[PDB]
Design a protein around this ligand. Structure first.
Ligand SMILES: O=C1NC(c2cccc([N+](=O)[O-])c2)=CCN1c1ccccc1O
Ligand SMILES: [Ca+2]
Lengths: 88, 478, 153, 233, 77
C-alpha cells in the first residue's frame, strides 16, 4: 500500500512535469527517424539485400554563387530583425 | 575626459591631430563626443589608418567604438589578418579561460570543442570573422559579440555554434561565476537563432529551407540543423518551420493534405496507385515510382514485413521445431540474414556512434543470440544442445518483440507517450531499491524466526527473496 | 486505453511465446496455443501469477502426453522422466513480466488518466454545455408526445 | 566620404523600397564613391530579395573625364579596380575634351529631367506628366547648382533633410545677411578656401532657391518615425 | 484543396458563389471576397456596414477555420 502508492504519485508528478515539454521532445526525436529514413537510397526492405550486392558492384569497380546569394538574402532579414528589436 | 579634451584640442598646434584626440576619447568612454566632433565634417577618413585604434578598441572592451568604426568604414576581413589573430589568441587571451578550455576538452569532449581546440592551438603558435567571434564569445564579452555577430554572413550558424560552445563551457565545475555568465550568454544566442530563423521562414519558405542545409564552407564543419541537434536545442526544431521541412521531407512526393488511410489503403492494394485517391503535388510509371520512393510508405511496408517476421518466428518456435530444420526455419534464417545485412550497413555508415544508441546495442545483442541459437541448434543427436538452442531462441524472441515499441514511436499519439515512458526509470529504480530493502529485512526475519539452519541455497533464496517478492502482488505469505 | 492495450499486447505476446516455447514441445492445437500464449499472460494483469513455471508445484495429472483430450501438454521430459526447463530461467522471467505489467504498465495508465482529467476539466464544463445543444434540439424539434404512444402519432 | 548614420540609412532603404513599390527610376552620380556605393548596395539587396515584380532601375550619369580605366569596344568590356560603381544597372557617361572638367554631366542630366517633366504619359494619377522628385542630403557646389537648375525649371519638387552640409543651411531658415549668418555657422571648414566674390554668387543662388518655397519641402527631426519619406514625397 | 479534402456545407456554398462570379445580399459577398484573401482590415470596415453582423462574424470564423487546415503554404494557414 505505502510503497506502491508512493510510486503512483511519483509517476503522476513526472507526467505532470514532462508533458508540456513532451511535445517538444517528441518532435525533437522525430528528426532522427526522418534522417535515418531519408539518408539511405532505400527500396522496400526484403529486396534491400539485392541492392547490397550492388554495393559490392561498387566494390567491383572501386565560392559558388547561389550559396553566396542565399547568404545575402539572409542578411536582409537580419537587418529587418535588428530593426524590430530596436523598435521594441 | 571632456576637460582633458578641451585642453588638448585648443593648443593651436594639435588642432589637426585627430589621432591623439581619438585615442584620448577612446581611452575614456566618450562615444558621443567622438561622434559629434571627430566623425562629422567628412573631411579626413583614410579608412586604412584606423587599424591601431581598432586593435585598441578590441583589446580594451570598447564595443561602441568598434561599432562606430565599422559604421564609418572599415572592412574586417581586410583588417583581420593572421598577425592580428595570433596576437589576440597569444597575448590578449586570458589564462583562466584557457584552463577552463583544457578542463572542458579533457572532461566534456565533443566535435565542436575539438574543432575550436584545434584552431585555438593553431593561433597560439579562411573565415576570419567567425574566428574573431569565437575569440570574443569564449572570453564572455557579451557585447563585442553582438557587434561582430551583426557583421557575419552565416548568421544563424554562428548563433547555433556559439550556443553550443557556451552550453559546453557552462559545465566546467570550477569558477562557477564564469559558468553562470556563459550559461546566460548561451541562452541569449539560442533565443537569437530561433527568432531570426522564424523571420526568415515567415518571409519565404524555399530559401529558408535552403538555409537549413548549408555548411558555411566549414564553419565548424557542420550544418545549421546538425548544430541545433548536437547542442540538444529542442526549441529550434519544435518550431513550425523546421517541422514543416521535416514533414515535407517525410511524405516525399505525396502531398501532405491527403488522409493517411488513403495512403495505407493504396499501400495494401498495390496497383491502385493509378487513381486519383493520392495527390502527388509536392506518366503512370512516374506515379508508381513516386509512390514507392517516399519514406512514409517504405517505412509502412517495412513494419508490415516485420510483423509477418514475428509471426513466422512464433510459428517456428512453438509449433514446428525438430531435429533437422524444416523449410520455414530456413526461411526464418534467411529473413534474419536480411536484418543482419541491414545492421552491418548501418554500422558501416555510422561507425562509432552506431554503438551510441541503445537500440543498436540491443539490436546487435539479439543478432548475436540468434547465431548462438544456431550453433547450439545444429548439434543434432544431442537432446541437451537442441533444447538449449530452443531456450536461446525464446529469449531472443523476447528481444525481437520488445523492439516493436521503438518501431512505433512515429505516431502523433503513440509517440509522445512512448517518450514519456522512458523518463520513468529513476522512479522505477527508487521503488526497486526501497522494495529490496524491505523485502530482504522481512525475508531474513521470517526465515530466521521460523526455521533453523537451512543449508541449501535455493531454499534460502526461495524463502528470503521470492515469497516476500510475491507479497507485492497481494499474496500474504503463508 | 489503446496505448495501454498496444504495450500490454506486446509484452503479453513476448512472454507468452517465450514460456510456451521453453516449457512444451510442438503443440498442434490452435486453441491450446492461444490459451497458453495470450490468455494466461492476459490474466496475469489482474494478479494471477502464471502457474506452471515452478517445477516443484507441477504435477503430471493435468497433462495429456499427446494431443488426445482437453488438458495441456506436459513439458518435454528428460531421459530420467524429469522436467527439462530450468527454474532459474523461468522464475525470473515470470518475475520480470509480472513487475512490468502488473505495476509499471498499469500505473503508467493511472498517470495518463490523471493528466488527461487535469487537461480537459476547465474545458469540460464548456464541452458539456456544448453537447447540451444536441439533446435540447432533438427533444424540442419533434412534436413529441409520451414515447409509448408516439407510434399512434 | 559619406557619414552613414542609421537614420539616413533607414531613409534611403525606405526610399529604394518606395522605388520598388512604385516602379521608379532613380538618377544618381554612379561612381563607386560615397553615397552611390550604398545606393548600389541597396539596389542589389532589393534585387536579390525578390528578383521579379518590376526590378528597379538605377541610372548613373558620369563625366568620362574622371574615370581611371577606360576601354573602347562596340563585344563586352571588363572594368576592374573616379571609379564607377558596379551595382548600377544602367550607366551613361557624357563626352567632353580633357580630364580637368567637372560638372559636365549636369547640363545633359538637367535637360533629361526637363524632358521627362514635359513628357506626357496619361497612364498614371498625376494627370499624366510622370512626376519627378529631386533629393538633396549632402553638400557641395553641384548640390546648389542642381537645386537651382531644378527650381528654375517647372516641377522641381525638391526635398531636403535637416542634417548634412547644405541640408542644414536650407532647412534652418524656412536677405543676404541671414544667408551669410547660417553659411558661416554651419560650414566652418569650407569657407576657409573660398573668396567672397562667389559667396555673393551663392547668396544669389539661394535667393533663386527661396524664390518659390512651395516647390521645396523638408524632412524634420520630430518627423522621424515610419513612412516619413512617403509623407515628404 | 479545401473543397476536395475538407468539404463542408458552407464551403460548398462559397464554392458555388465563387464559381458563379468567375463566369442578393451583396455586402456579404464582398465580405467573403475580402475575408478569403486574408485582408484583415478591409474586412472590419466592411463588417461594420453589414446588417447580419453576428451571422457574418460566425460564418467568417467558420470559413477561416476551414482554410487554416490546408497543409501547403502554412503562412496563409
Ligand atoms: O529495421 C529494423 N531492424 C531491426 C532488427 C534487426 C535485427 C535484430 C534486431 N533485434 O534483435 O533487436 C532488430 C529492428 C526492427 N527494424 C524496423 C523495421 C521496420 C520499421 C522500423 C524498424 O526499426
Ligand atoms: Ca538498428
Amino acid at each position: 500500500i505505502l510503497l506502491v502508492n508512493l510510486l503512483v504519485a511519483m509517476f503522476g508528478y513526472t507526467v505532470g512535469i514532462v508533458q508540456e515539454n513532451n511535445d517538444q521532445v517528441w518532435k525533437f526525436q522525430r528528426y532522427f527517424l526522418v534522417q535515418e529514413y531519408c539518408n539511405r537510397l532505400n527500396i522496400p526492405f526484403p529486396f534491400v539485400v539485392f541492392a547490397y550486392f550492388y554495393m559490392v558492384v561498387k566494390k567491383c569497380f572501386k565560392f559558388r554563387n547561389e550559396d553566396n546569394e542565399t547568404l545575402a538574402w539572409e542578411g536582409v532579414m537580419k537587418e529587418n530583425y535588428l530593426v524590430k528589436i530596436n523598435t521594441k | 575626459s571632456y576637460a582633458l579634451y578641451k585642453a588638448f584640442s585648443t593648443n593651436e598646434q594639435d588642432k589637426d591631430n585627430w589621432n591623439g584626440q581619438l585615442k584620448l576619447l577612446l581611452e575614456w568612454n566618450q562615444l558621443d563626443l567622438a561622434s559629434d566632433e571627430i566623425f562629422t565634417n567628412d573631411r579626413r577618413w583614410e579608412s586604412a589608418d584606423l587599424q591601431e585604434v581598432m586593435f585598441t578598441a578590441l583589446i580594451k572592451d570598447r564595443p561602441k567604438f568598434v561599432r562606430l568604426f565599422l559604421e564609418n568604414g572599415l572592412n574586417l576581413q581586410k583588417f583581420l589578418t593572421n598577425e592580428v589573430l595570433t596576437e589576440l589568441f597569444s597575448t590578449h587571451f586570458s589564462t583562466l579561460v584557457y584552463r577552463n578550455l583544457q578542463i572542458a576538452k579533457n572532461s566534456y569532449n565533443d566535435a565542436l570543442l575539438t574543432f575550436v581546440w584545434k584552431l585555438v592551438a593553431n593561433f597560439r603558435r579562411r573565415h576570419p570573422l567567425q574566428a574573431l567571434f569565437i575569440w570574443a564569445i569564449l572570453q564572455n564579452k557579451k557585447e563585442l559579440s553582438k557587434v561582430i555577430w551583426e557583421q557575419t554572413k552565416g548568421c544563424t550558424l554562428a548563433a547555433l555554434g556559439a550556443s553550443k560552445l557556451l552550453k559546453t563551457l557552462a559545465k566546467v565545475k570550477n569558477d562557477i561565476n564564469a559558468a553562470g555568465e556563459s550559461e546566460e550568454l548561451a541562452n541569449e544566442y539560442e533565443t537569437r537563432a530561433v527568432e531570426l530563423f522564424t523571420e526568415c521562414y515567415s518571409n519565404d519558405e524555399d530559401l529558408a529551407e535552403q538555409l537549413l542545409v548549408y555548411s558555411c564552407e566549414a564553419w565548424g564543419g557542420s550544418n545549421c540543423l546538425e548544430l541545433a541537434v548536437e547542442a540538444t536545442d529542442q526549441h529550434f526544431i519544435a518550431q513550425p518551420g523546421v517541422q514543416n521541412f521535416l514533414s515535407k521531407q517525410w511524405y516525399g512526393e505525396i502531398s501532405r493534405d491527403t488522409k493517411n488511410w488513403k495512403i495505407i489503403l493504396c499501400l495494401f492494394i498495390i496497383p491502385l496507385v493509378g487513381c486519383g485517391l493520392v495527390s502527388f503535388r509536392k506518366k503512370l510509371l512516374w506515379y508508381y515510382v513516386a509512390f514507392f520512393t517516399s519514406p512514409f510508405v517504405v517505412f509502412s511496408w517495412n513494419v508490415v514485413f516485420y510483423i509477418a517476421f514475428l509471426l513466422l518466428f512464433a510459428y517456428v518456435l512453438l509449433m514446428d521445431f525438430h531435429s533437422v530444420p524444416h523449410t520455414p526455419e530456413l526461411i526464418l534464417y534467411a529473413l534474419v540474414f536480411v536484418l543482419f545485412c541491414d545492421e552491418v550497413r548501418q554500422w558501416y555508415m555510422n561507425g562509432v556512434n552506431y554503438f551510441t544508441d541503445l537500440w543498436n546495442v540491443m539490436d546487435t545483442l539479439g543478432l548475436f543470440y540468434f547465431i548462438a541459437g544456431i550453433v547450439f541448434r545444429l548439434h543434432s543427436s544431442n537432446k541437451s544442445s537442441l533444447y538449449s538452442g530452443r531456450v536461446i531462441f525464446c529469449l531472443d524472441y523476447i528481444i525481437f518483440t520488445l523492439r516493436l515499441i521503438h518501431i512505433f514511436t512515429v505516431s502523433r499519439n503513440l509517440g509522445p507517450k512512448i517518450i514519456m515512458l522512458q523518463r520513468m526509470l529513476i522512479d522505477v529504480f527508487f521503488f526497486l531499491f526501497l522494495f529490496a530493502v524491505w523485502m530482504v529485512a522481512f525475508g531474513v526475519a521470517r526465515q530466521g524466526i521460523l526455521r533453523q539452519n537451512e543449508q541449501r541455497w535455493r531454499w534460502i533464496f526461495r524463502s528470503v527473496i521470492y515469497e516476500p517478492y510475491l507479497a507485492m502482488f497481494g499474496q500474504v505469505p503463508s | 486505453v489503446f496505448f495501454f492495450l498496444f504495450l500490454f499486447a506486446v509484452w503479453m505476446v513476448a512472454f507468452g511465446v517465450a514460456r510456451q516455447g521453453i516449457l512444451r514441445q510442438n503443440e498442434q492445437r490452435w486453441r491450446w496455443i492461444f490459451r497458453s500464449v495470450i490468455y494466461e499472460p492476459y490474466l496475469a494483469m489482474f494478479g494471477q501469477v502464471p502457474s506452471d513455471v515452478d517445477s516443484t508445484t507441477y504435477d503430471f495429472s493435468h497433462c495429456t502426453f499427446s494431443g488426445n483430450e482437453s488438458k495441456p501438454l506436459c513439458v518435454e521430459l528428460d531421459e530420467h522422466n524429469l522436467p527439462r526447463f530450468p527454474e532459474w530461467i523461468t522464475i525470473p522471467l515470470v518475475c520480470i513480466y509480472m513487475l512490468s505489467t502488473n505495476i509499471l504498465l498499469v500505473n503508467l495508465l493511472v498517470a495518463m488518466f490523471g493528466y488527461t482529467v487535469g487537461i480537459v476539466q476547465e474545458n469540460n464544463d464548456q464541452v458539456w454545455k456544448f453537447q447540451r445543444y444536441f439533446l435540447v434540439q432533438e427533444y424540442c424539434n419533434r412534436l413529441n408526445i409520451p414515447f409509448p404512444f408516439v407510434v399512434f402519432a | 566620404n559619406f557619414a552613414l548614420k542609421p537614420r539616413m540609412r533607414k531613409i534611403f532603404s525606405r526610399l529604394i523600397y518606395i522605388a520598388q513599390s512604385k516602379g521608379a527610376w532613380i538618377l544618381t552620380g554612379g561612381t563607386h564613391y560615397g553615397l552611390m556605393k550604398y545606393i548600389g548596395e541597396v539596389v542589389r539587396d532589393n534585387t536579390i530579395s525578390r528578383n521579379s515584380e518590376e526590378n528597379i532601375v538605377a541610372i548613373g550619369i558620369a563625366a568620362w573625364g574622371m574615370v581611371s580605366n577606360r576601354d573602347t569596344l562596340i563585344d563586352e568590356g571588363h572594368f576592374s579596380a573616379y571609379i564607377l560603381d558596379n551595382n548600377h544597372t544602367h550607366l551613361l557617361l557624357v563626352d567632353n575634351g580633357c580630364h580637368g572638367h567637372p560638372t559636365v554631366e549636369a547640363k545633359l542630366r538637367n535637360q533629361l529631367e526637363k524632358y521627362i517633366s514635359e513628357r506626357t504619359s496619361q497612364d498614371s494619377n498625376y494627370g499624366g506628366k510622370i512626376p519627378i522628385v529631386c533629393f538633396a542630403q549632402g553638400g557641395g557646389r553641384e548640390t546648389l547648382k542642381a537645386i537651382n537648375t531644378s527650381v528654375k525649371s517647372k516641377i522641381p519638387c525638391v526635398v531636403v533633410e535637416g542634417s548634412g552640409q547644405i541640408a542644414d543651411v536650407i532647412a534652418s531658415l524656412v536677405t543676404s545677411s541671414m544667408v551669410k549668418e547660417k553659411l558661416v555657422r554651419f560650414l566652418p571648414r569650407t569657407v576657409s578656401r573660398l573668396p567672397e566674390e562667389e559667396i555673393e554668387s551663392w547668396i544669389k543662388w539661394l535667393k533663386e532657391i527661396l524664390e518659390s518655397s512651395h516647390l521645396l519641402t523638408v524632412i524634420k527631426m520630430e518627423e522621424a518615425g515610419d513612412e516619413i519619406v512617403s509623407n515628404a514625397i
